[PDB]
Design a protein around this ligand. Structure first.
Ligand SMILES: [Fe+3]
Ligand SMILES: [Fe+3]
Ligand SMILES: [Fe+3]
Ligand SMILES: [Fe+3]
Lengths: 225, 564, 564, 113
């Protein structure tokens, strides 16, 4: 047989699916692991039959188990499911979003203090700036990137972006499509404003003293036209 | 910029004032404080915060973290708050706001995210200290994966393996067996500490054991827990700063409970299965829990009190102790009273610790679930604690978490190293998804490294595909396990080079400050009272008021999560 | 005497001119030469050749082999020929004709079969070098058995375990984590080499990592792959003779592909997942493959291009990177063009290596099958290579085998030790049954010892009874694993006694000659071209001509061999 | 799924029970391990249905397998059986005394002097 350690894992998963199937036939509402194994075994079966595409299965398995076919809170506990199976074209990952239909019960439920919005970067002075991606390809710029050092494809008053970053949630990015024009909101960088790296236009404190040198480097490197 | 509350919570987890349901229980943890600066939160990923010269510093720092757990919700006796956790040199380096002071506001000075920093996203996760199971019968090495899979990182107790003595008692007796077990311990990821035979009326035999590496002694009735044994054992423990654990004289052969208490003479002692089904003076052993010097714990089979607790015991006692089928009952009248009271005593903070009694009248991977099942049961029966401030169960949560984290650490003299989420302590932490809190952990960190975690298909294109099951990680392997695991010993053994002498490669640390720990020393479970048992009805009384609880027909953190 | 051709082949395997079908593919390996003397072939067994004073010498010799692989069909970049392989001191001592010069004609002088020689019958088997997987995320120690079971003996990459940073990047960051992982490595049978975080615009933090044992650096976007970090990283690698691997700026934040190429400045760099689905400058990362200094590799999920490749990715990207369900597409237009081109570019010798991207958008035990599936797919589409001389696919075979054997070894500076079936190299070899070539290996030899193999019932009267599955052998255990396994480090670390300082018992060897490896240095994949991408259609072009392939509806080495 | 090492053990026990059930249906007299697994799987099934108490099951399982349903000496070889299973109120130990009806054959019998 030459059973690989991954094939040995799949036998357990498949058997768990078979036990879950038996319990559903007995009329029992399936729990979290039973529901996952029941859907996994279905995916593994359809893949062996090699008549359905990954695309077909991903669609077919949404709400494969209904809210009344599982215990309360099971659906919310399993928002997505992933199962690798061998198809005629090889092993492929089958990703199901909402495999089990949710209900009103939520384990690990978060109840907010207030529905009021969170004021991020409170008290920082906002700078409105028109930017145009004159490049042939779209680009994104992160929340903490020194805006002044962004791709030379972006056309804007760079002097006004010196020592600033995007006033957007931490970890988010702003997209500027090829040819697209947008109004960005910039705020001054926190801490000491010791900007080291990125495009190396600054590599030091973003003060007035460093500004002319930085603008000259930006012009020389093609960021300022 | 104004961010929608739902969007904030999805991205970074809950903030100040938000309430989190612990698993499928009715317990609500409220975020007491958030150590972040809104807009400066760390997020790892493509185009995210933790990047060269942005969230990640380009400026070298003496405090560059080895690991950052971003946006964690800490649940500990110290508080229920939101913070970034910083690990360095396998210790909790700092708790607060991590990042780059060059580009960010309000960064905690010793929490530098730099080139050498690894990222772990804790946003929307609960971070707790690794549990300490102070009632282990070293019977089977297979208990260790089961324990880790349930958030337990340290195990105190004793044994040789599947032999009658161990099957019954937490005892690794004599020098040779202690040396053998301490050397066997090298294999594992679990932190260990061994107890020797305390049942002696002779000094020499007790001293030999402490010098052989024992972290203390277990006085167990199977080796005769007589007043002479109780006195001799405590006398040696007092001399060598080690802990004493006790399973009292069930059959009251040499005396009654008061005679045992008298023998102890106000000296520090860890009373196992204080309720008495696990063993001890019938029917009044529970009366010991009221005393200040008595450090009491519970074993998993009696907590929480369910409709099947009594039935299961009136036979589970016969398989463990190997009793005649001629013996039918006494336990049928004695047991309901004490098992019911036990749950309430936990809620009152009278019983300070929860333990397993692993494969010897108790379950290895049940300490954590059963503690929360009891917390939930009581909340459901007695309602929200009067001690609570606000629409939350924070005080009850802190009372219950202390039972398997800090309080066992204080009892065994390891509170300076482990037991809580505090700066300077060893990084033995557990990451939980709130929907699975108390039942199924995500990641187990020991000594700043991941040692065990839930992992999907080994071949798979991502770590999520089925079957997802618990597996050993890099921290549990090679020579890295010697860096992440601790073998606790007595000060005498430690100071006399037990590590070198036994060729132990693991971290060897001494237990200290065992003798002067009273009930007052515990966290959230310092309650002392006059506990009495009616010798006719077997009802338990706390200061003259009947102490009881109703049996549960169903428990939380059970049926929804397990296949079998 | 005249022996019937069928009888010869049954007894000794194929000879000069015979063609072997590789697995269930349409690839035919032709025996280019046979190093034997007909009638003098070595056969092991009762009344056979290898016996005292006959095929086995009674004359002592300095070259008495420790192991003889009789009548092997070698498949390597060096050639597809028939020979006896001789192992001595865990190295390939000789390739040619083994035996006894006292009783036999045409024996290769340094290939003495003697009293101390063990026999392994390779008659009718294919022998290849052990595969090198230069893109490993050290996420789970369970990847190792999966890898060995697929003919992979060496793994280069990074990680700390199942932490976000590792789930995304091949990085073991900083001194402490590097030390911890190198010590964890002791556990395994797999040869390892760790990469530190390259994403730094400061020298000190990069240098610390090379001195801590890193074999190179990985520049990943999640940590910020800016032109500043590209320059700083390569500058340190150039000083310390270590390799650099890159996952480019997908979002084009700090610049376009040409800006990244300019930052590199013609310096040697291993460009991971050259196609772009695994990550990198959208939509033109693939354009880098044409450049001489760029050492390009492909990851498993995109090779070969199938009817399910695009569908699988448009969701596999969302689980790995943890993206909002609000995001639907861009990848639906960009991806077909580059995935199709990738297959063609492999056949053209433009992409030089195959890698896994294990549990981080790629499969651990799929490097070898997927390489041969692509070779087969291309042979079926484009036909037999025009480069072939005869009714065989030898040139194509040599081009494809180099992708996971010799070319990764050249890239990482370990080509002098491993990577090919050559005299003087370490004996890291894989024995394959032709019917299972590229899908299921028979025996895995590491350092001259069997470390892993397909094995039947442990109780059974022979090693063939069911269930036959992959198991660890003696070479993988005890202190013998320290003799058969290598932990690769930088020269600086090696020369400064990292082995002793970290107490590593494994063989510690330095990586050397990383900085001056260009496309010209590779074996059978030295092709440079002008690769372009239309920014509107996303179509890839090689020298102005569209570079494409048709998606496969079924692949070889799959459905016939696997249960699930 | 997050399968604990104890859940992985229970799958083997349950599958062994399923194989034993099949063999009993074929009319084969069950041996020592088959008999233990057959009773264990029944206990595991009833616990999941969560309608029976531990007390009920301990009583129900006495002579669950009859002397003619098993090979000779099997009952004597298995004087008691223990199986932990998850009930709606949590994991509980089900202890059965004489799960298999004994026959007059005794392997390892002690005959007095
Ligand atoms: Fe006890
Ligand atoms: Fe005990
Ligand atoms: Fe990548
Ligand atoms: Fe990768």
């Amino acid at each position: 047989m030459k059973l690989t350690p991954k094939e040995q894992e799949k036998f357990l998963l498949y058997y768990a699916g078979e036990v879950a199937r038996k319990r559903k036939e007995e009329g029992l509402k399936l729990n979290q692991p039973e529901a996952i194994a029941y859907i996994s075994a279905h995916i593994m079966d359809e893949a062996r039959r090699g008549k359905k595409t990954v695309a077909q299965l991903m669609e077919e398995c949404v709400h494969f188990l209904k809210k009344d076919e599982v215990m309360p809170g099971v659906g919310n506990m399993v928002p997505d499911l992933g199962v690798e199976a061998n198809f005629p074209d090889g092993t492929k990952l089958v990703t199901v979003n909402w495999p089990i239909e949710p209900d009103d019960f939520k384990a690990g439920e978060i109840k907010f203090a207030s529905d009021k919005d969170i004021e991020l970067n409170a008290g920082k002075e906002i700078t409105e700036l028109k930017v145009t991606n004159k490049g042939p390809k779209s680009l994104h710029v992160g929340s903490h990137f020194h805006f002044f050092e962004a791709n030379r494809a972006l056309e804007f008053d760079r002097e006004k972006a010196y020592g600033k970053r995007l006033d957007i949630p931490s970890g988010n990015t702003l997209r500027i499509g090829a040819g697209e024009t947008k109004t960005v909101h910039l705020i001054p960088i926190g801490g000491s404003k010791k900007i080291i790296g990125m495009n190396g236009l600054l590599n030091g404190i973003a003060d007035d003293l460093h500004k002319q040198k930085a603008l000259e480097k930006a012009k020389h490197h093609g960021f300022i036209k | 910029m104004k961010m929608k509350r739902q969007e904030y919570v999805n991205t970074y987890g809950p903030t100040t004032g938000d309430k989190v349901r612990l698993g499928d229980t009715d317990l609500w943890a409220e975020v007491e404080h958030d150590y972040t600066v809104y807009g400066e939160e760390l997020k790892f990923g493509a185009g995210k915060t933790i990047r060269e010269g942005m969230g990640q510093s380009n400026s070298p720092d003496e405090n560059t973290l080895d690991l950052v757990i971003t946006n964690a919700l800490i649940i500990d006796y110290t508080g229920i708050y939101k913070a970034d956790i910083g690990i360095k040199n396998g210790k909790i380096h700092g708790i607060g706001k991590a990042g780059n002071k060059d580009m960010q506001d309000g960064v905690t000075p010793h929490m530098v995210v730099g080139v050498g920093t690894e990222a772990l996203a804790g946003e929307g996760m609960i971070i707790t200290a690794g549990g300490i199971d102070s009632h282990t019968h070293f019977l089977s090495p297979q208990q260790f994966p089961t324990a880790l899979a349930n958030g337990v990182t340290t195990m105190f107790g004793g044994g040789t393996g599947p032999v009658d003595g161990t099957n019954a008692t937490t005892i690794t007796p004599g020098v040779w067996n202690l040396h053998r077990m301490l050397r066997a311990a090298e294999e594992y990821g679990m932190n260990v500490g061994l107890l020797g035979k305390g049942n002696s009326s002779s000094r020499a035999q007790l001293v030999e054991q402490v010098k052989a590496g024992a972290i203390g002694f277990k006085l167990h009735e199977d080796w005769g827990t007589t007043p002479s044994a109780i006195d001799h054992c405590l006398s040696v423990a007092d001399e060598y700063d080690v802990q004493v654990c006790i399973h009292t004289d069930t059959v009251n052969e040499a005396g009654y409970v008061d005679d045992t208490l008298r023998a102890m003479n106000g000296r520090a002692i860890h009373a196992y299965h204080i309720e008495g089904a696990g063993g001890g003076h019938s029917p009044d052993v529970i009366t010991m829990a009221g005393e200040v010097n008595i450090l009491p714990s519970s074993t998993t089979p009696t907590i929480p009190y369910t409709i099947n607790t009594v039935a299961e015991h009136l036979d589970m006692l016969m398989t463990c102790h190997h009793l005649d089928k001629r013996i039918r009952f006494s336990q049928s009248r004695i047991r309901p009273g004490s098992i019911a009271a036990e749950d309430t005593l936990h809620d009152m903070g009278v019983i300070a610790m929860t333990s397993s009694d692993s494969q010897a009248m108790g379950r290895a991977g049940e300490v954590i679930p059963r503690t929360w099942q009891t917390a939930d049961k009581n909340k459901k029966e007695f309602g929200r604690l009067t001690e609570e401030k606000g629409d939350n169960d924070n005080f009850r949560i802190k009372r219950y978490i202390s039972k398997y984290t800090i309080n066992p650490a204080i009892t065994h003299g390891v509170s300076e190293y482990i037991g809580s989420v505090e700066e300077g302590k060893i990084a033995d932490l557990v990451v939980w998804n709130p929907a699975f809190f108390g039942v199924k952990p995500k990641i187990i960190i020991k000594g700043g490294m991941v040692v065990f975690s839930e992992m999907g298909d080994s071949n798979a294109s991502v770590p999520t595909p089925q079957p997802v099951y618990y597996r050993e990680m890099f921290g549990h392997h090679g020579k890295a396990k010697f860096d992440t695991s601790i073998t606790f010993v007595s000060k005498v053994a430690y100071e006399n080079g037990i590590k070198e002498k036994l060729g132990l490669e693991r971290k060897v640390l001494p237990v200290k400050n065992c003798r002067n720990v009273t009930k007052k020393d515990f966290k959230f479970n310092n309650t002392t009272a006059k506990i009495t048992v009616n010798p006719e009805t077997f009802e338990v009384f706390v200061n003259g008021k009947l102490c009881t609880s109703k049996p549960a027909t169903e428990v939380a953190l059970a049926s929804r999560y397990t296949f079998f």
